[model samples]
Structures are given as C-alpha cells and as structure tokens.
Target: MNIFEMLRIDEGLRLKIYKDTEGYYTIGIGHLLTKSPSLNAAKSELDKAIGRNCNGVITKDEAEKLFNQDVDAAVRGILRNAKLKPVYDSLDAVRRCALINMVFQMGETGVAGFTNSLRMLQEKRWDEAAVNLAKSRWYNQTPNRAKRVITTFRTGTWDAYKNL
Candidate 1:
C-alpha cells in the first residue's frame, strides 16, 4: 500500500469531506462526526500555506485587493486632497484619465510634489506642464511611461510614445 494510504488507514486521516447531515462543511478524522470540531490549529496552518502568515510579501489575491483599494483612493482622493479637484474637473476625459493614472503611479504626495506641473495644469498650460513633468526624477527613471503621460497631457494621446 502507498505510504500515505497506509498512514491514512493507520492514523484515520480522511481527505475528502462528506455531507454533514446538518449541511455544515466537515472534514478530517476529528471532524468525521462532529459538526463543529476545534479547527484553530488547522485554520492557522491553512493560513500559512496560503501566505497569510508571510511577514509582508503577501499573495497575488491580497496584492490585487490592495491594488484595487489604492487605485480607488488615487483616482478619487488625490484630486481632492491635492486641492486640484477643480483643475482636474475642468480637463477633458482623456486628460483627466491620464492625470489620474499619473497620480496613481506616483501616489498623492508624489503628484502633489509636482508643484510647477500642477500649477501649469491649473493654468491650462499644456506645454508648460509637459516641460515641468519632464524635468522630474520620475521622468528620468521611467522615460517611456513619463513620455506616455506627457504626450497624453500634450496631445491627449499616446502618440509620442508610439512614435519613439
């Protein structure tokens, strides 16, 4: 017999769970009969296996969840918190979406740190805003994305990035 099968037969470990007559999810050798057996230890082991107990690395599902939450705030809160609500509101949908995306990548404070760019944006100086944005460390580090952002602001399209 397979070691696992022998061990299961010897230790009385059950892999599949059956209907609990009461309709509760029941599993394991201990839970074979009891509707609600102590599962604290099992739950903790499951959590570790699924990465919940990882120091801070987290799982893909958790990262995606946090991404959703962060993007929601970046899209909405940054405009108001950075005191650029009216400025972003006055922009066209394409420009507005691009600006929101920039804030999302840079964070509220990072976007807020672009004082001159924001000023140019508020003043409706598209070219000046692009120039101001290009001068940033953000631009130097991620030229392609910065190109996309600047071109979006400049021409309301990703044309520049594609051209280069």
Candidate 2:
C-alpha cells in the first residue's frame, strides 16, 4: 500500500490539532506543529497549513500547494541530476518540461538509465530521442503517457494529444 494509505490506517486522518502519544502537536494527515521550525521556511506552505490549531481542516489550496511542492521538486531534480546540462538547457520549454515530467514519473535514476534516449537527446536528435524513448520499459508499462510525452518531444507542441 502507498504511504498515504498506511498513514491513514496507522495515524488516521486527524484534522484537529492533537498531541500524539509521543507528545508532538500534529494535525491534518500527519503534519506536526512546531515553533521555530526549520521545515516551515516556505511562507506559502505555512499559509496553507494551520498554525497550532485545535480545530482545523486541510483546505483545497493547502492540498494543491503540497502537490505543487512535490511537482516543483521533481522538476528541479531533473536539472540537478541530468548529466547533459547543456543539452537540457538547449531544449525548448515544452521539451524541457516533457523531460522533467518523465523524470518525475520514472525518477531520476530510472530516466537516467535510458542511456540511449539520453544520448539521443544530448546529441539533439529529437526524432531519435523519441524513438529511443519508445523502446524503453517505461513506454511498455505506460504506453498512453509515453505516447503523449514522446509526441511532445517529437513535435515540440503540447496540443497533439490528451487523456494524459
């Protein structure tokens, strides 16, 4: 089971702030309340979650912010982990985002292991990169998403497909 389901079974979904048996003030799923927290450095994150409240619930904005944080981190991870920085930088925004999303879905190491695809991309062989991407286990596992992502890489346009 996923961590969310495990947490739900173990911790339950507590909307109100309450001290766990270990004495940490927690609320909403498993978020802990803290003073002078090193983790609450982001103002948007702080604004999204409640502050030391005995009664509260997660807002849609808060949920979206959390999801966005994961997405942003995943996208940034692609740039940090990819070896071919110049090639990555040379791609258009659509192509770059496609690569970032692929890295997000497959993980950096998983995407990085696509050596043939990465090599094609690094050589600026867009069509070859697309073809190499299709030859991957990822494409075999998720043909629909791979199709859209590869098409994005091939055409440099986002309007060619849907149901992604």
C-alpha lDDT score of every prediction, in listed order: 0.58, 0.59
**By summed lDDT, which 10 consecutive residues of candidate 1 come out lowest?**
2-11
Model 2, 85-148: lDDT tens digits are: 5556878876776776665455677777787877777777888888888987778866766787
Give me the runs in candidate 2 sitting further than 4 Å from their true place. Answer: 1-59, 82-84, 162-164
Model 1 residue 127 distance off true place after TM-score fit, in angstroms? 1.7
lDDT of 1 by residue, 1-164 (tens): 22122212222333333333334333342132224443544444434544555331334454344445545676677557746676687788667766776665555777777778887887889998898899988788767667777887888664543443
Query: What does each candidate score in C-alpha RMSD?
Result: 19.0, 10.8
Residue pairs that clash (backbone atoms under 3 angstroms), model 1? none
lDDT, residue 26, model 1? 32
